[PDB]
């Protein structure tokens, strides 16, 4: 499927506004499980429940364990670019 590059803008006091599931220990990609209403992912658009997050800000998430992806994602700030594919 198409790999989309999706922009999200975040203030430091905000979260991304997504929940993630999956990861290497489960044999699946990092997958978006929820978009939270009114938070940056919802406001900015472009992300979809069931999307695999292949990368964020150029950092590859394809073979990351869940907690590793949580760390990387949680450390991104400001103008953030996701690369996602719906699965």
């Amino acid at each position: 499927g198409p790999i989309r590059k999706v922009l999200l803008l975040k203030e430091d006091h905000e979260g991304l506004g997504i929940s993630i599931t999956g990861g290497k220990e489960h044999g699946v990609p990092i997958l978006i499980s929820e978009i939270h209403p009114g938070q940056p992912a919802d406001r900015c658009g472009g992300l979809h429940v069931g999307d695999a997050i292949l990368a964020v800000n150029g950092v590859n998430l394809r073979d990351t364990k869940h907690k590793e992806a949580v760390t990387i994602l949680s450390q991104q700030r400001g103008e953030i670019e996701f690369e996602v594919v719906y699965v």
Binding site: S19, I20, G23, H26, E34
Partner: peptide, 7 residues
């Protein structure tokens, strides 16, 4: 069986 984390 999967973890789920809000970010």
């Amino acid at each position: 069986r999967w973890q789920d984390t809000r970010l």
